[PDB]
Design a protein around this ligand. Structure first.
Ligand SMILES: Nc1nc2c(ncn2[C@@H]2O[C@H](COP(=O)(O)OP(=O)(O)OP(=O)(O)O)[C@@H](O)[C@H]2O)c(=O)[nH]1
Ligand SMILES: Nc1ncnc2c1ncn2[C@@H]1O[C@H](COP(=O)(O)OP(=O)(O)CP(=O)(O)O)[C@@H](O)[C@H]1O
Ligand SMILES: Nc1nc2c(ncn2[C@@H]2O[C@H](COP(=O)(O)OP(=O)(O)O)[C@@H](O)[C@H]2O)c(=O)[nH]1
Ligand SMILES: [Ca+2]
Ligand SMILES: [Ca+2]
Ligand SMILES: [Ca+2]
Ligand SMILES: [Mg+2]
Ligand SMILES: [Mg+2]
Ligand SMILES: [Mg+2]
Lengths: 423, 54, 343, 438
């Protein structure tokens, strides 16, 4: 019993978190009321990782829903699977965070964070052997970014020997709500560098480009973006939710994927991304899964080197042919894999495929090309900060300009650390 | 090619064939290392809580 | 798309083979320390055979036979011929040789002097030559030979006092043959050999007319390039000479003995070096050195494990290496005489 | 009679141990409930099979085995398996969370908290013994528990049982089935700290077992169940002399005497033949000469290497089935004239031969075909050092960049243990080279 405690913070965090629980509940046979109605015992073998079992054979997600506004969480409670969540795990305020990291992290969020930790502690106490936490949030807003990183710091203080994993949505001017998103993201990235063991970088720029270029959607919505996120999150947690030998818990995943503590930011990928009845072959799954157009971080892998790679194939397929194609991609493009980490590409296979797909493949790369994402944010940060533009929103909450300068320096240090291992 | 030391029993036999002649730390010391490593884990955790307290 | 690595930058033969592999657009060169290769052009010394054949899903091949040094070393070859029943001490095509360790270090000092005294009394020719894999002394007195070695392991073998002398010139030579052994242990003899000839008249009473090395004839011989370009006579001219002068052919008088010696040496070590049931495969190119006496009898001098080729023959031989040794294992999208044998 | 206690550590050790005791019961006619009809001394005895099985007054034959794992899911397969009735709960030790493929986590952090419980459960088995020989320890190199806790357990066994022998069955890491990039680290770390505590260690390379399962059993993608049934056959061949009447390798001390002249060079190479697919309706039975000849084919070794390019220090042949000494000596004389069998000058060029007339037992429904005769050769070759050179090279590549080192330091291990373990391995490779290279 290796339980994970799930936390979703802010608008983006709760909308993507709600879809994640909607997707994996279907995969595990859990209906919107928490009653199991599946046809395979594989669905319940590792069900306790994410679900609590209550009276009446009811399965309750081990999920805590956090926001500084009630709006999005009211939509969740009215959503498809809204009634499945534990009612006492809705922790919300009323003021909102105004897309302001300082409000989430220092003022408005500080007033609410203790009541969230009370719910975290209650869920942790009912864990046979808690292995760690996963957080869904965006970095561009105020609650998910500012209060989310505040939560991560206080959770690390109370559970210093547990793994912290995040799905962190990176802002992009292509899909932007406010101009201060680079400020909020830069402040949050340093928090993640220090206080997470694994972070999946979900870039809204990549999600838009995939919807537009590949899926041929002229006007992508936040719903279309969250479809790619939902499918990716199911794929990267399959090894946690179903029986397997590789990266079966959060700590073993970290040991395999993180050669240096600060370089723990992963580029996810998914295949297929189809705009739909045609069967997809193992060579096609393997080629698309490594294609830049299937990456969720808007970084070109050929501009960097893979430190480690995990690949997960779902569905009934030839495991021999999977190995042949996986060993084919490595042995044909071995210049993009570091030579000082032998056998750094690990492959796993799960029999149960996602809903509506005969087979699929999920990519998890620790690539030095992720420095392109942080460089992009850093340039957008500096373009405003050199003129101190929009800073009054933050100094009005008690912050000083020096904390911005130190955040700017910290992320440029992170970029430089990726650059030394690329050479 | 010499067969030596042939022993036979109900369940088998064994022999040797020659083709050519020729031409700890104490219980205390272990506990010290285990405790020295535990102390380094306690020092690293205290430095973390100190960092988080700041 | 096959991959390969290069680990011997001084190899002229495989520098061309690497060039030919890239010219087909189906072979990609990797860094020298990248273990995800199909083919290794390995280094000469301390090739890491123990790390080959452990890459999942990669058929790996290397251009050297592990253990073939026993045939390609001075002292090792003499011990191999004397101690192997397939070759035996009564071997007729290898000069009587003895392994002599220097006194500042088994050894055959007493056995060499025993046969040396048999020739001194019997009025026979008693000229021997000392050499090693590391500096060569030819003498008729056994005292000068043993004293020079003490001044690494050395060998002393009978110096062929009656060599076949080409005319005009009255000059000495030696024959180099290139032999390719593939992963199936097929023995391929390159149809083109070279005669590395001395340009000085052979004086049976100065080492310039006694050693036919291409470097010695270019640094100490005052007739370099006089009779043939670079003191290199190829098989066409040598065969025509044997017909015009000796009324015989190169095939009958010499090449039958050469192919016989090559088979005997390589079949003898086949159980020790074969990669037939091994987790990796090997091939290797060998350079055999032969001496011919006045009776048209061929003698084996040495086997070179990392030989160079003649400038005129690089393109033909290196292409042949790619055909039968590399493309037979990794096919894409005869200049050799196959010496048939029983595996 | 003198007893032997088996210790299974980590997933690999437990799942292999489960396959071995399944085979032992089939070989000794012991039913899943522990009853042994052929045993006429009910409730006691000092027969050869009692070295591995104790007896209860009710006639149950109980393995002298301890299972240890830092995660309960694998040992729970033993609690609810076919042979669950053999074991009592005192023999199955589980923890809450595993070592996460981290030697330091299994050795220091979690090892310190469970070592006393393990030694106490071992002491309960040792008190059943009138004359304990020692221990057989099954573990992987690559796992955090199999590497980290094993080396700690081996240190404490040398303290609490100083005069007892200790043998290992170790699973060498192969990327084709491995689950961790840091397994080279764990392998070198556990070998360094266990070297002076193990009298004789049988390494099994998962790469060799994998390819034998694909080549000779026609399994496209072998699973752990396929691999472990083959390993348990080899293991049974090695321990059969301790469990049956005989005169060769009758106690643990004789393994060291017959296979390990130099104590640090205590890794014998195992080669097994024949391995025949059960799906073959009829296979021509191989002769004594053919299975003995197959003992010198690298494709049949537990570790892929080339014994031609090394020297032998000792060589045992362990036959099972229809084999008579006449056919063994005929095969050996033929092989001496065809193979490059070079012994070191300070050891006789010979073969210690053991024959057990009972043919190999195969698990019903398994992948292995029943054969009339089989052989396991245990030879101490310097050629097995190729496996160390492969491992040490992968260690060097990662450690030059300190990749993943922070995971180990974060568990309380000093970085110097890395370099100290690596230097010991460099000295090990030097020992092998001085013994087997001219
Ligand atoms: N032959 C064989 N190898 C196994 C088996 N199980 C695991 N392995 C190998 O063991 C290595 C991993 O070590 P494990 O034994 O699984 O890990 P552990 O000892 O339980 O330690 P933890 O890290 O705490 O889980 C890998 O190289 C696997 O290939 C098995 O059942 N049979
Ligand atoms: N027993 C013998 N009788 C007559 N001549 C001999 C001889 N042994 C050697 N030679 C001569 O000495 C020369 C050099 O002999 P050796 O083979 O030792 O040189 P080497 O090995 O450096 C040539 P390579 O570069 O092809 O290896 C040969 O060209 C040969 O003519
Ligand atoms: N992919 C995705 N991104 C979102 C969603 N909602 C908001 N975002 C992004 O998140 C950032 C805004 O943060 P938000 O979560 O709305 O603020 P918060 O409520 O204070 O945490 C912007 O970069 C948006 O592009 C969503 O549903 N899906
Ligand atoms: Ca207030
Ligand atoms: Ca009894
Ligand atoms: Ca001891
Ligand atoms: Mg918003
Ligand atoms: Mg030479
Ligand atoms: Mg385990």
């Amino acid at each position: 019993m290796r339980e994970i405690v799930h936390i979703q913070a802010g608008q983006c965090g709760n909308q993507i978190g709600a879809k994640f629980w909607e997707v994996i509940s279907d995969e595990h046979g859990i209906d919107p009321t928490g009653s199991y109605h599946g046809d395979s015992d594989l669905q319940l073998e590792r069900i306790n990782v994410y679900y609590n079992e209550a009276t009446g054979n009811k399965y309750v997600p081990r999920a805590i829903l956090v926001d500084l506004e009630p709006g999005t969480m009211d939509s969740v409670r009215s959503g498809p699977f809204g009634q499945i969540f534990r009612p006492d795990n809705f922790v919300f305020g009323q003021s909102g965070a105004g897309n302001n990291w300082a409000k989430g992290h220092y003022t408005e969020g500080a007033e609410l964070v203790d009541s969230v930790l009370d719910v975290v502690r209650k869920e942790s106490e009912s864990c046979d052997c808690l292995q760690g936490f996963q957080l869904t949030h965006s970095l561009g807003g105020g609650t998910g970014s500012g209060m989310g990183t505040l939560l991560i710091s206080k959770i690390r203080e109370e559970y210093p020997d547990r793994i912290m994993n995040t799905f962190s949505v990176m802002p992009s001017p292509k899909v932007s709500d406010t101009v201060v998103e680079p400020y909020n993201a830069t402040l949050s990235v340093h928090q993640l560098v220090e206080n997470t063991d694994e972070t999946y970088c979900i870039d809204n720029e990549a999600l838009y480009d995939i919807c537009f270029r590949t899926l041929k959607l002229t006007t992508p919505t936040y719903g279309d973006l969250n479809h790619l996120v939902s499918a990716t999150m199911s794929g990267v947690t399959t090894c946690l939710r179903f029986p397997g030998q590789l990266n079966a818990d959060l700590r073993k995943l970290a040991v395999n994927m993180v050669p240096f503590p600060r370089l723990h930011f992963f580029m996810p990928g998914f295949a297929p991304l189809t705009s739909q009845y045609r069967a997809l072959t193992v060579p096609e799954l393997t080629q698309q899964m490594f294609d830049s157009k299937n990456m969720m971080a808007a970084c070109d892998p050929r501009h960097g080197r893979y430190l480690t790679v995990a690949a997960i194939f779902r569905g009934r397929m030839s495991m021999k042919e999977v190995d042949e194609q996986m060993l084919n991609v490595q042995n044909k493009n071995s210049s993009y894999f570091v030579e000082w980490i032998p056998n750094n590409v690990k492959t796993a296979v799960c029999d149960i495929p996602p809903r509506g797909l005969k087979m699929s493949a999920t990519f998890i790369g620790n690539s030095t090309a992720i420095q392109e994402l942080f460089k992009r944010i850093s340039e957008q940060f500096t373009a405003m900060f050199r003129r101190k533009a929009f800073l009054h929103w933050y100094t009005g909450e008690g912050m000083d300009e020096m904390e911005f300068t130190e955040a700017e320096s910290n992320m440029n240090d992170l970029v430089s650390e990726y650059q030394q291992y690329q050479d | 090619m010499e067969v030596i030391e042939l022993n036979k029993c109900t369940s088998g036999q064994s022999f040797e064939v020659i083709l050519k002649p020729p031409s700890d730390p104490s219980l205390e010391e272990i506990q010290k290392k285990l405790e020295a490593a535990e102390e380094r884990r306690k020092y690293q955790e205290a430095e973390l809580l100190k960092h988080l307290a700041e | 798309m096959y991959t390969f690595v290069v680990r011997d930058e001084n190899s002229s033969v495989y520098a061309e083979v690497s060039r030919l592999l890239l010219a087909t657009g189906q072979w990609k060169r990797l860094r020298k320390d990248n273990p995800r290769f199909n083919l290794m052009l390995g280094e000469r010394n301390r090739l890491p055979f123990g790390r080959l054949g452990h890459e999942p899903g990669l058929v790996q091949l290397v251009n050297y036979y592990r253990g073939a040094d026993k045939l390609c070393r001075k002292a090792s070859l003499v011990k191999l011929i004397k101690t192997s029943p397939e070759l035996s001490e009564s071997c007729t095509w290898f000069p009587e040789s003895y392994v002599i360790y220097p006194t500042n270090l088994t050894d055959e000092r007493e056995v060499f002097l025993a046969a040396y005294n048999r020739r001194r009394e019997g009025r026979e020719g008693n000229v021997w030559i000392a050499k090693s894999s590391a500096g060569i002394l030819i003498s008729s007195e056994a005292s000068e030979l043993l004293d020079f070695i003490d001044e690494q392991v050395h060998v002393i073998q009978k110096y062929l006092e009656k060599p076949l002398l080409l005319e005009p010139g009255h000059r000495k030579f030696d024959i180099r043959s290139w032999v390719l052994v593939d992963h199936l242990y097929n023995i391929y003899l390159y149809r083109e050999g070279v005669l590395r000839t001395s340009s000085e008249p052979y004086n049976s009473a100065d080492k310039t007319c006694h050693l036919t090395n291409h470097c010695i004839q270019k640094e100490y011989s005052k007739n370099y390039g006089r009779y043939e370009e670079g003191n290199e006579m190829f098989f066409e001219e040598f065969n025509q000479y044997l017909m015009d002068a000796l009324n015989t052919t190169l095939e009958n008088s010499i090449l039958l003995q050469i192919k016989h010696i090559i088979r005997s040496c390589l079949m003898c070590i086949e159980p020790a070096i074969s990669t037939k049931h091994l987790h990796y495969q090997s091939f290797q190119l060998f350079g055999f050195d032969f001496m011919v006496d006045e009776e048209l009898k061929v003698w084996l001098i040495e086997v070179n494990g990392a030989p160079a080729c003649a400038q005129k023959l690089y393109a033909e031989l290196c292409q042949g290496i790619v055909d039968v040794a590399i493309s037979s294992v990794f096919p894409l999208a005869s200049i050799f005489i196959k010496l048939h044998h029983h595996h | 009679m003198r007893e032997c206690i088996s210790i299974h550590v980590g997933q690999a050790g437990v799942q292999i141990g489960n396959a071995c005791w399944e085979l032992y019961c089939l070989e000794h006619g012991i039913q899943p409930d522990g009853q042994m009809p052929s045993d006429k001394t009910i409730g006691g005895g000092d027969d050869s099979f009692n070295t591995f099985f104790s007896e209860t007054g009710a006639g149950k034959h109980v393995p002298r085995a301890v299972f240890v794992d830092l995660e309960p899911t694998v040992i729970d397969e033993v609690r609810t398996g076919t042979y669950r009735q053999l074991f009592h709960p005192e023999q199955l030790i589980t923890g809450k969370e595993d070592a996460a493929n981290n030697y330091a986590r299994g050795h220091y952090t979690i090892g310190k908290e469970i070592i006393d419980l393990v030694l106490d459960r071992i002491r309960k088995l040792a008190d059943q013994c009138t004359g304990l020989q020692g221990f057989l320890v099954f573990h992987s190199f690559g796992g955090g528990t199999g590497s980290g806790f094993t080396s700690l357990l081996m240190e404490r066994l040398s303290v609490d049982y100083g005069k007892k022998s200790k043998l290992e069955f170790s699973i060498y890491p192969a990327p084709q089935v491995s689950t961790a990039v840091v397994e080279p680290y764990n392998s070198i770390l556990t070998t360094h700290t266990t070297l002076e505590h193990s009298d004789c260690a049988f390494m099994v390379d998962n790469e060799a077992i994998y390819d034998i399962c694909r080549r000779n059993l026609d399994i496209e993608r072998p699973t752990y169940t396929n691999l472990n049934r083959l390993i348990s056959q080899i293991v049974s061949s090695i321990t059969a002399s301790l469990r049956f009447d005989g005169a060769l390798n009758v106690d643990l001390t004789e393994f060291q005497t017959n296979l390990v002249p130099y104590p640090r060079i205590h890794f014998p190479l195992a080669t097994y033949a024949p391995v025949i697919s059960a799906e073959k309706a009829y296979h021509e039975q191989l002769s004594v000469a053919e299975i003995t000849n197959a003992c010198f084919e690298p494709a049949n070794q537990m570790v892929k290497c080339d014994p031609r390019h090394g020297k032998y220090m000792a060589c045992c042949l362990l036959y099972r089935g229809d084999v008579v000494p006449k056919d063994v000596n005929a095969a050996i004389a033929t092989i001496k004239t065809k193979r490059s069998i070079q012994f070191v000058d300070w050891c006789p060029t010979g073969f210690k031969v053991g024959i057990n007339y009972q043919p190999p037992t195969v698990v019903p429904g398994g992948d292995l075909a029943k054969v009339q005769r089989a052989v396991c050769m245990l030879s101490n070759t310097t050629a097995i050092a190729e496996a160390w050179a492969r491992l040490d090279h992968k260690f060097d590549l990662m450690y030059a960049k300190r990749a993943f080192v922070h995971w180990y330091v974060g568990e309380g291990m000093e970085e110097g243990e890395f370099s100290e373990a690596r230097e010991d391995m460099a000295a090990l490779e030097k020992d092998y080279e001085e013994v087997g290279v001219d």
